[PDB]
A paper describes a structure:
The most common variant is SPINK1 p.N34S. We solved the crystal structures of TRY1 p.S200A bound to SPINK1 WT and p.N34S at 2.9 and 2.1 Å resolution, respectively. The structures of both SPINK1 variants are mostly similar, with small differences only present in the loop orientation of the p.N34S mutation site. However, due to high flexibility of this loop, side chain conformations are poorly defined, and changes are unlikely to translate into functional effects. Asn34 or Ser34 does not directly interact with TRY1. However, the neighboring Tyr33 residue engages in a cation–pi bond with Arg101 in TRY1. This interaction causes Tyr33 to be pulled away from the core interface, making room for a sulfate ion in the SPINK1 loop. By comparing both structures, we show a slight tilt of the p.N34S variant’s α-helix. While we show minor differences between both structures, they do not translate into different binding constants or other functional differences. However, our crystal structures prove that both SPINK1 variants are mostly similar, and the minor differences we detected are unlikely to translate into functional or clinical effects.
(1) The serine protease inhibitor Kazal type 1 (SPINK1) inhibits trypsin activity in zymogen granules of pancreatic acinar cells. TRY1 adopts the typical serine protease fold containing two β-barrels sandwiching the active site cleft of the protease. The inhibitor assumes a typical Kazal domain structure with a reactive loop surrounding a central α-helix. SPINK1 binds on top of the TRY1 p.S200A active site in a substrate-like manner, creating an interface of almost 1000 Å2.
Author numbering:
A (entry chain C): 20 to 79
B (entry chain A): 24 to 247
């Protein structure tokens, strides 16, 4: 599994409220950080203008 | 729960957890066989655990009961989180005692200034990751419709309300969704969403349980 095969996917968030659901549904970012849910990673990328992708669902 | 305290043993006997591999949401026992939680907590398989205080070390009053039936509100809206509510039918009747018991639905909609108790195993840090072992409790008042709409313009439906502090520092957080907001012995709210946790002028938003009292009993009745 080389570079192209292992690429992350874009956080996709459906909710449009300038806020997130309070579920714990963790995702693992390409930065090695666990985000408590996909909405919070979307919010964080928007806020800080970053492009952290999802390596996989669950904690890192 | 950010800025809360360890719940006293026997103070939230109605608190449950929803589990899929881990602690992912809370819920409230509202009948010997039924839990109420958030629509966004829906999964096709859920194990309900009752009587937990410490979520990592068994204390001996825990009950582990798989969901027979998991019913997200049929008008749940993923874009707006309108009707962020869900019923779980336990595959067996909970055994009722001092550590496990039901909480009444609300007989009238939330009143501004009412003291509520919020509980859960969600994050304790507004920054980073601090998930506690010990169940967390928060005292927080119901906020006016005006402060709620000011905080979340055009995003508060008549099925939502605000509880907490405009000053920030105290709130529900990720992992608290589906958890209870109990005011004067009634489940007035379910933990739903907000703009982060414990941010200035961004109090938690809660599903207004009063508006679902008829759908809750009707749906329980039809599936008994």
């Amino acid at each position: 599994p080389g570079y192209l095969d292992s690429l992350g996917r874009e956080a996709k968030c459906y909710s449009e409220l300038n806020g997130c659901t309070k579920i714990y549904d963790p995702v693992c970012g390409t930065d090695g950080n666990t985000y408590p849910n996909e909405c919070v990673l979307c919010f964080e990328n928007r806020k800080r203008q970053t492009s952290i992708l999802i390596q996989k669902s669950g904690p890192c | 729960i950010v800025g809360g305290y360890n719940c006293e043993e026997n103070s939230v006997p109605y608190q449950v957890s929803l589990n899929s591999g881990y602690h992912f949401c809370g819920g409230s026992l509202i009948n010997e066989q039924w839990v109420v939680s958030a629509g966004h907590c829906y999964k096709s398989r859920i194990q309900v655990r009752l009587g937990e205080h410490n979520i990592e070390v068994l204390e001996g009053n825990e009950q582990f009961i798989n969901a027979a039936k998991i019913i997200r509100h049929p008008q749940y809206d993923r874009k707006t989180l309108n009707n962020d509510i869900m019923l779980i039918k336990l595959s067996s009747r909970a055994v009722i005692n001092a550590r496990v018991s039901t909480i009444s639905l609300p007989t009238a909609p939330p009143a501004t200034g009412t003291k509520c108790l919020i509980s859960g195993w969600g994050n304790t840090a507004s920054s980073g990751a601090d998930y506690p072992d010990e169940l967390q409790c928060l005292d927080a008042p119901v906020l006016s419709q005006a402060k709620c709409e000011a905080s979340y313009p055009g995003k508060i439906t008549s099925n939502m309300f605000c509880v907490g502090f405009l000053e920030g520092g105290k709130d529900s957080c990720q992992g608290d969704a589906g958890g209870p907001v109990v005011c004067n012995g009634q489940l007035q709210g379910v933990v739903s969403w907000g703009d982060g946790c414990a941010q200035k002028n961004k109090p938690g938003v809660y599903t207004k349980v009063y508006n679902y009292v008829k759908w809750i009993k009707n749906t329980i009745a039809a599936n008994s």
